[PDB]
């Protein structure tokens, strides 16, 4: 259900080499809030952020999350590149991630295993509000 406490979801960006703007993945619900992967070029590195409830018109929400942002390596998963984040998402800071997740030249290098048919796959494993739960 949308009330699950954790989830893993991927977002593939096609024609990556041509990417000239910021793109958003469709939503993945965790603890009933919409989480999305945000990717964009940064001045060259790949910007990779996790967004939560960005379209809410209320300031009365929060999500204490721990997540792993990863760019998958089709050839050898052991070679996929990951970075962890920990953040209390709320209206003033509803996305969190790395403006310099990886060098653009390193991710687009066809001999590195992060791009196939000009496609790069981003993945996020997110756990929300695990500090909250039933008393027993």
Residue numbers in the entry: 63 to 105, 113 to 205
What do the study authors state?
Herpesvirus-associated ubiquitin-specific protease (HAUSP, also known as USP7), a deubiquitylating enzyme of the ubiquitin-specific processing protease family, specifically deubiquitylates both p53 and MDM2, hence playing an important yet enigmatic role in the p53–MDM2 pathway. Here we demonstrate that both p53 and MDM2 specifically recognize the N-terminal tumor necrosis factor–receptor associated factor (TRAF)–like domain of HAUSP in a mutually exclusive manner. The crystal structures of the HAUSP TRAF-like domain in complex with p53 and MDM2 peptides, determined at 2.3-Å and 1.7-Å resolutions, respectively, reveal that the MDM2 peptide recognizes the same surface groove in HAUSP as that recognized by p53 but mediates more extensive interactions. Structure-based sequence alignment of the three HAUSP-binding peptides revealed a conserved four-residue binding motif with the consensus sequence of (Ø/E)-G-(Ø/G)-S, where Ø denotes a non-polar residue.
After many unsuccessful trials, we once again succeeded by engineering a chimeric protein with the MDM2 peptide (residues 223–232) fused to the C-terminus of the HAUSP TRAF-like domain (residues 53–197). We crystallized this chimeric protein and solved its structure at 1.7-Å resolution. The MDM2 peptide assumes an extended main-chain conformation, extending across strands β3, β4, β6, and β7. Five residues in the MDM2 peptide, Asp225-Ala226-Gly227-Val228-Ser229, make extensive polar and non-polar interactions with the surface-binding residues from all four strands, particularly strand β7. At the N-terminal end of the MDM2 peptide, the carboxylate side chain of Asp225 accepts a charge-stabilized hydrogen bond from the guanidinium group of Arg152 in HAUSP. The side chain of Ala226 in MDM2 packs against a hydrophobic pocket formed by the backbone Cα atom of Gly166 and the side chains of Phe167, Trp165, and Ile154 in HAUSP. At the C-terminal end of the MDM2 peptide, Ser229 in MDM2 makes a total of three hydrogen bonds to surface residues in HAUSP.
